[PDB]
């Protein structure tokens, strides 16, 4: 009737944790000329076999609003963008007064022809040049005459992006380092917070396109059964409402003008690439959304919001007036940065047909203050040629603001709100393979990794090797990957050192001389080896775990030797 | 070098009696040189009392 | 003084290097620093009073 502690190595027990993740890309996905801004050449090529092990009898609490993976992805995207722009031309000589004339189309001065005096590569020669700029890039200086300055030159240094750096989003996979795993929620209509029943284990996640846009989510992924309204509290209108669509809505954005690309040499080894002449007429950049498809998209959204917000009248408003970078829809495609008024999409009351296409006006801005940050700015060089965007609308970010009505507006906060839309299904967990259980002695279908997590302690103990095998295996990703590898090695070696002290370094399961104390768990073996999962068992003895290890070191080898 | 470690410390009261004022001269975008403008009050020597 | 003229002067360090200005937000107040042994090594301390 006496029980003794037994040490099990390879236990399918995991706990919520934060850790540095690494990137993977599908093949090189470059021609050696694009030099993608996301540094995809430094990522590990993906494994063609995605694994994907469904965990039976595992229900796990997920919370998309406290997911460390979102904060880490946002940090990595900012770090990569800063590292990419760093080795490029700094446009410090351009904080000069611009003499700008309005360009008369054959808009109302949207393109200005600005002349200015700058140095050449020879420093002692001063050249008068001209360039075309968008109205949003030039701010009046002093009075209302033709004198202008660049929007941010007075407070920060504008860095010209290197013309060889592509901004095309390419799907990026975030794989966890050895010793950690990513759990995926496979529920068809997941609320975004709460227990998930269909949980699978996957070392990497699907490809995520790091698309930078606001108000409307582009590309990414769609819902499987219906439009899902996520949000956090819903009563508190301060929280962002993330809307995932079932079907995509095609959005055809374009810039019709055919500008030239004039290279103005600024100094030794440095050139400014700007817009030269306009070939053809001047036509407004715009975006086409099918009217009927958007109509049904809002019909589905209003139905779901009405269900969530009780039977109130839903009214959609456009954003307030203000700086285009704040209040307009924004996106980058083709290498060009578009800002669109987005006022024809949220202008209706649903309660309880002039044209079939919604054409949104858009503007182009070359000086972009991205990531809601000031003190740094980028100049976007001209692309040359017409731009065809042809993107998919797959989700919305809505915010909420009194006669029995609720007002929703396009909006959202920082870019983390977009990453949640893709990361809502994933959680990062740390593996702790070493567990202890009572046994009577003194001193299968090949389920995949953690497939026994929902199994009883018995039968789960027959898969210790499956979990055991997954403990192993100068830029942003290089050093982080090296740190992850060293830390995984340290974790493995620490577990091996503990087993070596216990004398179990060569054993997956070892029985010690320490008797089981009934104060730890006054339960029979049938009450422990059946019914309980390893997760429940580690929870029940968590507050006593440190005591058991002490006895093993205090006894066994310390005396047996 | 002879390092002398004392049994008891000796209190040293050092003062810079002048107040001055601080002015910013801009050098470039977002950056400035910080220097003294006009001295307020009398000119008194900085000194230490032991 | 950079010339016989008794009204011409230059920064003391200018002629040899570019002078870096300390950021005013940086405090120079000393804070206790402890050195800790890395894994594989140990730090011994002598407790002899004299």
């Amino acid at each position, epitope marked *: 009737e006496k029980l003794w502690v037994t040490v099990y190595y390879g236990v399918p027990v995991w706990k919520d944790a934060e850790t540095t993740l690494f990137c993977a890309s599908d093949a090189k996905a470059y021609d050696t000329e694009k030099h993608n801004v996301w540094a995809t050449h430094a990522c590990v090529p993906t494994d063609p076999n995605p694994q994907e092990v469904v965990l039976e009898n595992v229900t796990e609490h997920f919370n998309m609003w406290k997911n460390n993976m979102v904060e880490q992805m946002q940090t990595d995207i900012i770090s990569l963008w800063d590292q990419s722009l760093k080795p490029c031309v700094k446009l410090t000589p351009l904080c000069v007064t611009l003499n700008c004339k309005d360009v008369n189309a054959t808009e109302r001065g949207e393109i200005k022809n600005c002349s200015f005096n700058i140095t050449t590569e020879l420093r002692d020669k001063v050249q008068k040049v001209y360039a075309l700029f968008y109205k949003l890039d030039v701010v009046p*200086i*002093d009075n209302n005459n033709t004198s202008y300055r660049l929007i941010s030159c007075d*407070t920060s240094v504008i860095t010209q992006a290197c013309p060889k750096i592509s901004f095309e989003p390419i799907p990026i996979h975030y794989c966890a380092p050895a010793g950690f795993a990513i759990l995926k929620c496979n529920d068809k209509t997941f609320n975004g917070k709460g227990p998930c029943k269909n949980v699978s284990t996957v070392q990497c996640t699907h490809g995520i396109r790091p698309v930078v846009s606001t108000q409307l989510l582009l590309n990414g992924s769609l819902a499987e059964e219906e439009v899902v309204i996520r949000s956090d509290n819903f009563t508190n209108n*301060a*929280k*962002t409402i993330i809307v995932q669509l079932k079907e995509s809505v095609e959005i055809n954005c374009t810039r019709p003008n055919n500008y030239t690309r004039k290279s103005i040499r600024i100094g030794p080894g440095r050139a400014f690439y700007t817009m030269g002449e306009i070939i053809g007429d001047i036509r407004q950049a715009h975006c086409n959304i099918s009217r009927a498809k958007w109509n049904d998209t809002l019909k589905q959204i209003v139905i779901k919001l009405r269900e969530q917000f009780e039977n109130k009248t839903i009214v959609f408003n456009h954003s*307030s*007036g*203000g*700086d285009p*970078e*704040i*209040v307009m829809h924004s996106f980058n495609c083709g290498g060009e940065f578009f800002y669109c008024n987005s006022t024809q999409l949220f202008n209706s009351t649903w309660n309880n047909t002039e044209g079939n296409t919604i054409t949104l006006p858009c503007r182009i801005k070359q000086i972009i203050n991205m*990531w*809601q*940050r*000031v*003190g740094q700015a980028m100049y976007a060089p001209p692309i040359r040629g017409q731009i065809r965007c042809s993107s998919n609308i797959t989700g919305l970010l809505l*915010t909420r603001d009194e006669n029995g009505t609720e007002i929703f507006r396009p*909006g*959202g*906060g*920082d870019m*983390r*709100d977009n990453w949640r839309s893709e990361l809502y299904k994933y959680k990062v967990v740390k593996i702790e393979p070493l567990g202890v259980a009572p046994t009577r002695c003194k001193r299968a279908v090949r389920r995949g990794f953690l497939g026994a997590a929902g199994s009883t302690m018995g039968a789960a103990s027959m898969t210790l090797t499956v979990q055991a095998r997954n403990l192993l295996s100068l830029g942003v990703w290089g050093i982080k990957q090296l740190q992850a590898r060293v830390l995984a090695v340290e974790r493995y070696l620490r577990d091996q050192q503990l087993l070596g002290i216990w004398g179990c370094s060569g054993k997956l399961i070892c029985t010690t001389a320490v008797p089981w104390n009934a104060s730890w768990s006054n339960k029979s073996l049938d009450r422990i080896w059946n019914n309980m999962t390893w997760m429940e068992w580690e929870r029940e003895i968590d507050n006593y775990t440190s005591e058991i290890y002490t006895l093993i070191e205090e006894s066994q080898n310390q005396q047996e030797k | 070098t002879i390092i002398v470690q004392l049994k008891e410390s000796v209190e040293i009261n050092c003062t810079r009696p002048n*107040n001055y*004022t*601080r*002015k*910013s*001269i*801009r050098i470039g975008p*977002g*950056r*400035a040189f*910080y220097t003294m*403008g*006009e001295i*307020i009050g009398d000119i008194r020597q900085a000194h230490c009392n032991i | 003084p950079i010339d016989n003229n008794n009204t011409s002067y230059r920064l003391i360090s200018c002629d040899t290097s570019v002078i870096t*200005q300390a*950021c*005013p*937000k940086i*405090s120079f107040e000393p804070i206790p620093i402890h050195y800790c042994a890395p894994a594989g090594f140990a730090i011994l301390k002598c407790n002899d009073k004299t």
Partner: antibody
Amino acid sequence: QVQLQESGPGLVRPSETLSLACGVSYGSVDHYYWSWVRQPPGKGLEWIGYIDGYDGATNYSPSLKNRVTITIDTPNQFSLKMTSVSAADTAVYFCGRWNLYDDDHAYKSLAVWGRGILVVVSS
Amino acid sequence: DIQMTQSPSSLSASVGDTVTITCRARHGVGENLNWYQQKPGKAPKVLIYMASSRQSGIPSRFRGGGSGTEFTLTISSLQPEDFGTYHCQQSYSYPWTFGQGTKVEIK
């Protein structure tokens, strides 16, 4: 330690021009963004506008842009001239210094405030 | 012209507890949010600069934090002198608007 002090009339008529001076004591009008902020009674703070110190360029809040002129009249004083006042403009007006140089403690916050002058618009 | 909402609009607490004040921007602003303390009859004092950092001379009890649209000011071990109206300010985009402010009373 630079201090600022507002000076001006307490009452202005509903159709006259309001002129408020801000003196600088232990300092001068150096290369910071010198600005004015309004506090209507019972309300939060409203920005009026700022003027630079490196040059004479100014930047006013759009909603008051056509009603506000800010100039510097001497190294130790600058002033706010707000035309076409109305009853809605009754407020405590604060003078302050907006620090923009990053290497200091206020990377972007009004860091030296005055004491505040109450201006009442009435007949 | 980003509009700011602060919550709660009226706050009270005993000496020594830990309290929070939430400031919400209509639009995302990164970390460019300041916090100020205005005592009755006096001009406001700067407490928090870019969302999380403190002004020298302000005790560690006043901690900030947050980014994007949700910012908080946490006042631990609240003392009798920490009475007055707290304001948040947007440094991201001109006009640098302010919230209406939350009054903190001592009980």
